[PDB]
Motif scaffolding. Structure first.
Motif, short mmCIF file in Angstrom:
data_model
loop_
_atom_site.label_atom_id
_atom_site.label_comp_id
_atom_site.label_asym_id
_atom_site.label_seq_id
_atom_site.Cartn_x
_atom_site.Cartn_y
_atom_site.Cartn_z
N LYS A 242 -60.78 27.48 28.09
CA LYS A 242 -59.46 27.14 28.57
C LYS A 242 -58.89 25.96 27.81
CE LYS A 242 -57.70 27.78 32.48
NZ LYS A 242 -56.72 28.66 31.83
N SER A 247 -51.03 27.91 24.23
CA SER A 247 -50.13 28.08 25.39
C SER A 247 -49.71 29.52 25.69
CB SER A 247 -48.80 27.36 25.15
OG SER A 247 -48.90 25.97 24.98
N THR B 17 -46.54 27.79 32.00
CA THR B 17 -47.89 27.70 31.41
C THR B 17 -48.88 26.91 32.27
OG1 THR B 17 -47.70 25.72 30.11
CG2 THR B 17 -46.74 27.62 29.11
N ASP B 18 -50.12 26.80 31.84
CA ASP B 18 -51.13 25.96 32.45
C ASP B 18 -51.36 24.66 31.69
OD1 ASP B 18 -52.31 27.49 30.31
OD2 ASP B 18 -54.24 27.61 31.33
N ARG B 19 -50.51 24.26 30.74
CA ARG B 19 -50.70 23.02 29.99
C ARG B 19 -49.42 22.34 29.58
NH1 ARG B 19 -54.74 24.87 26.58
NH2 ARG B 19 -54.74 22.99 25.44
N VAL B 33 -54.67 20.25 30.65
CA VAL B 33 -54.85 21.66 30.89
C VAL B 33 -55.32 21.84 32.31
CG1 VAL B 33 -55.85 23.76 30.00
CG2 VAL B 33 -55.62 21.87 28.50
N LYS B 34 -54.61 22.66 33.08
CA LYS B 34 -54.96 23.02 34.44
C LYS B 34 -56.12 24.00 34.41
CE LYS B 34 -51.20 23.93 36.84
NZ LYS B 34 -50.05 24.73 37.31
N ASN B 35 -57.20 23.71 35.11
CA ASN B 35 -58.50 24.31 34.86
C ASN B 35 -59.25 24.61 36.16
OD1 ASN B 35 -60.79 25.03 33.36
ND2 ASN B 35 -61.67 23.06 33.70
N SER B 40 -58.35 19.17 32.47
CA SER B 40 -59.03 18.60 31.31
C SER B 40 -58.03 18.00 30.37
CB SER B 40 -59.89 19.63 30.61
OG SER B 40 -59.11 20.71 30.22
N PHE B 46 -52.82 10.80 15.45
CA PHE B 46 -52.23 11.15 14.17
C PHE B 46 -52.92 10.45 13.00
CE2 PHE B 46 -48.11 12.12 16.63
CZ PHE B 46 -48.27 13.50 16.51
N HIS B 55 -62.00 14.02 24.77
CA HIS B 55 -61.52 14.67 25.96
C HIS B 55 -62.42 14.35 27.14
CE1 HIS B 55 -64.51 17.96 26.23
NE2 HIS B 55 -64.57 17.80 24.91
N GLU B 288 -44.90 23.29 22.22
CA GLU B 288 -46.11 23.93 22.76
C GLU B 288 -47.42 23.46 22.12
OE1 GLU B 288 -46.37 25.46 25.43
OE2 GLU B 288 -44.25 25.75 25.86
N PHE B 289 -48.57 23.91 22.63
CA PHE B 289 -49.87 23.27 22.39
C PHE B 289 -50.34 23.10 20.94
CE2 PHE B 289 -54.48 23.72 21.69
CZ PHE B 289 -54.80 22.39 21.95
N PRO B 290 -50.26 24.11 20.06
CA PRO B 290 -50.55 23.85 18.66
C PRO B 290 -49.35 23.06 18.12
CG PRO B 290 -49.99 26.17 18.93
CD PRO B 290 -49.94 25.49 20.29
N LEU B 293 -45.95 20.30 12.95
CA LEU B 293 -45.81 19.03 12.25
C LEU B 293 -44.51 18.32 12.64
CD1 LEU B 293 -47.13 19.79 8.71
CD2 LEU B 293 -48.29 18.49 10.44
N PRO B 294 -44.54 17.02 12.93
CA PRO B 294 -43.38 16.16 12.98
C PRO B 294 -42.56 16.35 11.71
CG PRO B 294 -45.29 14.92 13.70
CD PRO B 294 -45.74 16.23 13.08
N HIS C 127 -43.90 25.98 9.86
CA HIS C 127 -43.05 25.93 11.07
C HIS C 127 -42.72 27.33 11.59
CE1 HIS C 127 -42.56 21.65 10.32
NE2 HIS C 127 -42.12 21.95 9.10
#
Lengths: 564, 424, 193
Positions: A242, A247, B17-19, B33-35, B40, B46, B55, B288-290, B293-294, C127
């Protein structure tokens, strides 16, 4: 104690400080081949040292005799050793012929340092105390066993080490009595070596899905024989899947999406890579519930498919080509029907990986493929050595099959696993039909004198496949008493028997404190007492070799042994 | 009436989502992350040379975070649980509970090398030292956002009964100062479909992030997508907020003049001259999670008349008068921020004096490019005003050369008076 | 001889990669090497050293591509794809290609080489979703291959013009175009008095 779970970062940073240079190779990893968990541990640990640019050498080792040979010839520039999957239960300081005075440097101050470190990554117990307390060169990693379990042994070890007449008699035999009870415990595996290295990657901050898959593979290999340990670790693996999964849900499949789901992974043999019929026919657990060696057991299997409502002609289709409606209805068919046969425990959730469009593999199915590569991937001293060379050579087939670029070698493995399990089964039926398991009160004996393709069973792992099949078969029968089992098989060329001592286990759904392999002492103690010729050199010290004519004298003294 | 919600800089809602991210800034980002009824938390950096990611599993369900270069601070808004986790782990973690009244919540948290700071929906403001020893309890207008950078602290306050306001502080190991206390903040609240409302239920103020620039000048990025930087704050009687990106306009400009709804900016840091941000694409405003890049957006003063850009484009080409007006304004504001940093703090990289020399060079070249338009339209008076603001005596030689090329001999004589006056 | 036969008049694809690895690329560092006013240093001899000793985490910079790949092999960098590796700019080039049968579009000389390097080594730094980029790199590869097959109907004794053809697209065709135009020239000059 030696390196507790809290302090694996210090042992790792000590490797970087001692053994990172761009000048030379300085790090050696000795890995026990013939162990999937040591393989998956060493794969993770090499991907880590790749990323840190640490120049390293990996040497696969078969057994203790080769450990002494390879250690004896290490170049003196090599200043860190990892012993992955072995050596925790032997006195390594005595066995390797270390004297720390030949290794000490910069002795100034309440201080020492040494020209070599020997880090022991091992899950077997009972730990040898002269490694865990009694040395500064050997550096064990721990799951927690020492602080939780060894406090009385720690005290007994030191009060006896200090004490180099009533007040003495009253105490020296108390502390030797604590050690003498600590030894005289049988062998067990209590953790996965891969979950230890994944908890090190979690301390450094290196976790990703590739290291998590190797953690799942290494840990899954325990489930067949140490189910009690797989069930401790399984909750911790679910949380990491998990945590690392991205996402998106209701996601479109694309050639680039790796998905590592937790989903139904039925306790069946190579389901996604074989038929639905062969999945049941060659499963250890199914065979044990249905008595599937004899033809009334085969009737119970057809009578089940007929009652489930799957034609035999469909059940025998290769799972890709088996029809789209059955493959989605299957969860409902099993949840309706398996209970009638007591097969209810086949329903299980496990880890399933799919990469792009190339179709899913479960962690269970992947370790069946990787073991089949170790087992069959390719003047008695030459006849052993040119065989042990083969088992070192096979380690690199299993290693390369962990790479996603090399699916054709995984697909070799998945075909070889189906060739092996068929040969195990065709031998296991011969044993049960011909009544070759003799009851000897203290233990059960089985001895393969002759048979078809008997020349497989000289690999220690293939003997353990047949062992685990005969154990599941016995462990589910409600009338048999649980007894240790001795399984022996001849090599007609070397003229020895490969003998394996096997622990029984509780039926796969019942839910106790573990039982321990004390053949590892009984074989040593009978060997020390006799003038017989044996090899006691394997890392799983429940396995030995003995010359043909010496076997009956050996078993004759094994039944007398109070150590089982 | 209004509902106080826990804030953390650049954090995002769960949505479907869960995160989510608890926070992001120049140091790193944190996600939860909802687990299965516990959580977690992964803390990521950076800079991977200095900091190692980690974690842990969280039994308490933290929803506030602040991450800096010394440690991470966590809070649980509904129960008053806080935890500080130093990054070296030579220092121990510590945990504390702060006394919440019925319906009170922690609205935000911050940390400084010597202090941990907590603000609540009733406007109590609790300071603990870096080791968890209580140092104070103030009462203020309720603090809806906090930030720190080193010893500087910047807080935004809001209540029905007080309006929007901010405070700026520099607490220090010695010589503690409060630069501004509860001054009014010139930033727009949102015009109170679910693409916006699933965000405004999570963050009613619409502050996407609150940060200091890398040179320690406060910044805020509001519901109006405009980056406001506080100028000259070290001297309060001369302070002003500068709108240094209108990021809606700067998006419309780069998408070639399409009114563009599928793209949103998400701000992380203002390194000098350039907003690090995620450009988010899709129907949700937040990443979103991944974590992508800024991207980098260069700051632009809001002098772009969209209607003039429309008529001259019908890739966007910008009229060279409008482009010179922006480069002159952008250079005038940036040279004042550097100048005050170099005079009050001192340089942190030796480059800063060579940046300032190069920045004055772009100001005078922008003014001369405006002086040419004033000569082309023969407005000798406008031209003389543009020449008077010009800095380098060597650049004023170009003004007289342009006025001869334009044949405006009045400007020639007047400019010669400026040379001598400035020499004296 | 001293040089292998398969190299005698052309470059291997690995030498065409080596040439492309000498170009500048933009990156986001994940290390701060820049020392504050309030240590090992790069000291290179074929490229600008002053860009690497001045890295600050997550402020973009340009470095030579073979250093970006060496940093990205550790976690110590991320590689910013050029503007032309965007699903917008690739789709404008595909439209240009379909619209002008007579010409190749103004893609940079290294476009196939750099796409193949970054899709393998920097797969996470786009991207846009990389399966749509691979899809459009293939759409461009295939249209230019038709235009090449049309161009070869004109092999000549005098010259050709091949304006926007990539270095990798020239390098596959070199031992065919030049070998045939060499025999057309020999057959022609033989006819002359």
């Amino acid at each position: 104690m030696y390196y507790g779970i809290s302090q694996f970062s210090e042992a790792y940073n000590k490797i970087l400080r001692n053994s990172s240079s761009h000048s030379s190779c300085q790090l050696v990893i000795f890995v026990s081949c013939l162990n999937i968990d040591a393989l998956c541990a060493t794969k993770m640990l090499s991907l880590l040292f790749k990323k840190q640019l640490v120049q390293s050498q990996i040497v696969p080792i078969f057994g203790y005799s080769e450990l002494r040979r390879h250690y004896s010839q290490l170049d003196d520039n090599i200043n860190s050793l990892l012993l992955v999957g072995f050596g925790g239960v032997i006195d390594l300081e005595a066995f390797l012929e270390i004297d720390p005075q030949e290794y000490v440097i910069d002795t100034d101050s309440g201080e020492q340092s040494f020209r070599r470190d020997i880090y022991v990554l091992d899950a077997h117990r009972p730990w040898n105390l002269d490694n865990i307390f009694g040395s500064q060169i050997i550096q064990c990693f721990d799951d927690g066993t020492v602080d939780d379990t060894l406090g009385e042994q720690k005290e007994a070890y030191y009060k006896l080490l200090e004490l180099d007449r009533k007040q003495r008699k009253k105490q020296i035999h108390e502390y030797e009595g604590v050690l003498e009870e600590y030894y005289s415990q049988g062998t067990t595996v209590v953790n996965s070596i891969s979950a230890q290295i994944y908890s090190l990657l979690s301390a450094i901050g290196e976790t990703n899905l590739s290291n998590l898959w190797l953690n799942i593979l290494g840990t899954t290999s325990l489930d067949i024989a140490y189910a009690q340990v797989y069930n401790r670790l399984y909750p911790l693996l679910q949380d990491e899947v998990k945590r690392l999964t991205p996402s998106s849900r209701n996601s479109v499949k694309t050639p680039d999406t790796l998905t590592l789901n937790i989903q139904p992974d039925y306790y069946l043999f190579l389901l996604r890579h074989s038929s639905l019929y062969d999945s049941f026919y060659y499963s250890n657990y199914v065979n044990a519930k249905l008595s599937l060696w004899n033809e009334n057991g085969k009737k119970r299997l057809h009578k089940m498919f007929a009652r489930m409502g799957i034609p035999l002609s469909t059940a025998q289709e290769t799972w890709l080509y088996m029809d789209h409606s059955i493959k989605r209805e299957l969860g409902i068919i099993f949840d309706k029907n398996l209970d009638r046969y007591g097969l209810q425990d086949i329903i299980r959730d496990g880890f399933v990986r799919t990469l792009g469009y190339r179709g899913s593999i479960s962690a269970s199915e992947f370790v069946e493929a990787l073991t089949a590569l170790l087992e069959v991937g390719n003047n008695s001293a030459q006849k052993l050595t040119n065989l042990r060379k083969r088992w070192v050579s096979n380690f690199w087939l299993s290693w390369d099959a962990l790479d996603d670029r090399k699916v054709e070698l995984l697909n070799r493995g998945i075909q070889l696993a189906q060739d092996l399990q068929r040969a195990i089964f065709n031998t296991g039926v011969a044993i049960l039909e011909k009544k070759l398991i003799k009851h000897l009160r203290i233990y059960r004996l089985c001895v393969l004198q002759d048979g078809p393709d008997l020349d497989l069973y000289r690999n220690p792992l293939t003997l353990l496949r047949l062992g685990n099949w005969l154990i599941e078969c016995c462990a589910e029968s409600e009338d048999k008493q649980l007894l240790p089992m001795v399984l022996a098989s001849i090599d007609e060329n070397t003229d020895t028997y490969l003998v394996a001592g096997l622990t029984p286990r509780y039926p796969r759904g019942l839910d106790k404190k573990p039982i321990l392999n004390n053949f590892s002492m009984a074989f040593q103690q009978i060997t020390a007492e006799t003038d017989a010729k044996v090899r006691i050199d394997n890392f799983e010290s429940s396995i030995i070799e003995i010359r043909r004519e010496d076997l009956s004298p050996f078993l004759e003294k094994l039944t007398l042994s109070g150590l089982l | 009436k209004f509902r106080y919600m826990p804030f953390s800089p650049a954090g995002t809602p769960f949505g479907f989502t869960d995160r989510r991210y608890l926070t992001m800034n120049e140091v790193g980002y944190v996600s939860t992350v909802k687990n299965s009824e516990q959580y977690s938390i992964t803390v990521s950096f950076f800079d991977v040379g200095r900091f190692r990611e980690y974690h842990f599993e969280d039994l308490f369900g933290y929803d506030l975070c602040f991450l800096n270069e010394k440690g991470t601070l966590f809070g649980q808004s509904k129960t008053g649980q806080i935890q500080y986790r130093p990054h070296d782990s030579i220092h121990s973690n510590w945990t504390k509970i702060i006394p919440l009244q019925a319906g009170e919540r922690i609205t935000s948290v911050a940390a400084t090398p010597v202090r941990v700071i907590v603000g609540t929906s009733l406007g109590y403001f609790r300071s603990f030292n870096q080791f968890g020893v209580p140092f104070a309890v103030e009462k203020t207008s309720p603090i809806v956002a906090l930030t720190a950078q080193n010893y500087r602290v910047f807080s935004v306050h809001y209540s029905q009964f007080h309006g929007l306001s901010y405070s700026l502080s520099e607490l220090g190991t010695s010589s503690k100062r409060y630069y501004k206390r509860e001054c009014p903040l010139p930033m727009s609240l949102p015009n109170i479909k679910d693409a916006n409302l699933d965000y405004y239920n999570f963050n009613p103020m619409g502050i996407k992030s609150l940060f200091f620039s890398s040179y320690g000048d406060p910044c805020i990025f509001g519901s109006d997508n405009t980056l406001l930087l506080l100028s000259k704050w070290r001297s309060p009687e001369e302070s002003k907020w500068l709108p240094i990106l209108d990021s809606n306009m700067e998006i419309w400009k780069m998408s070639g003049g399409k009114e563009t709804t599928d793209i949103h900016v998400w701000p992380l840091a203002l390194a000098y001259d350039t907003l690090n941000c995620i450009l988010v694409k899709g129907k949700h405003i937040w990443p979103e999670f991944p974590l992508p890049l800024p991207s980098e957006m260069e700051i632009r003063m809001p002098v772009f008349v969209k209607s003039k850009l429309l008529e001259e484009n019908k890739e966007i080409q910008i009229p060279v008068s409008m482009a010179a007006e922006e480069e002159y304004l952008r250079s005038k504001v940036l040279s004042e921020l550097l100048t005050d940093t170099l005079e009050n703090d001192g340089e942190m990289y030796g480059n800063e004096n060579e940046v300032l020399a190069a920045l004055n060079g772009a100001y005078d070249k922008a003014l001369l490019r405006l002086f040419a338009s004033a000569c082309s339209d023969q407005n000798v008076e406008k031209a003389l005003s543009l020449a008077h603001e010009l800095k380098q005596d060597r650049a004023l030689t170009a003004a007289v050369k342009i006025s001869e090329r334009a044949e405006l001999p009045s400007l020639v004589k007047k400019i010669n008076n400026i040379r001598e006056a400035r020499y004296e | 001889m001293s040089l292998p036969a398969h190299l005698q008049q052309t470059f291997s694809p690995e030498e065409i990669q080596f040439i492309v690895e000498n170009e500048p690329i933009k990156i986001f560092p994940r290390i701060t090497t820049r020392q504050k006013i309030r240590h090992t240093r790069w000291q290179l001899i074929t490229t600008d050293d002053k860009a690497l000793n001045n890295m600050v985490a997550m402020r973009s910079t340009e470095v030579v591509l073979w250093i970006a790949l060496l940093l990205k092999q550790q976690s110590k960098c991320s590689i910013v794809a050029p503007q032309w590796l965007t699903t917008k700019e690739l789709d404008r080039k595909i439209q240009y290609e379909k619209t002008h049968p007579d010409r190749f579009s103004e893609l940079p000389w290294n476009w196939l080489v750099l796409a193949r390097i970054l899709f393998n080594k920097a797969k996470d730094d786009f991207h846009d979703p990389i399966h749509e980029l691979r899809g459009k790199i293939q759409d461009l590869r295939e249209i230019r291959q038709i235009k090449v097959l049309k161009g070869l109907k004109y092999l000549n004794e005098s010259h050709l013009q091949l304006d926007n053809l990539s270095l990798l697209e020239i390098n596959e065709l070199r031992p065919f175009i030049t070998e045939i135009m060499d025999k057309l020239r020999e057959i022609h000059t033989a006819s002359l008095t």
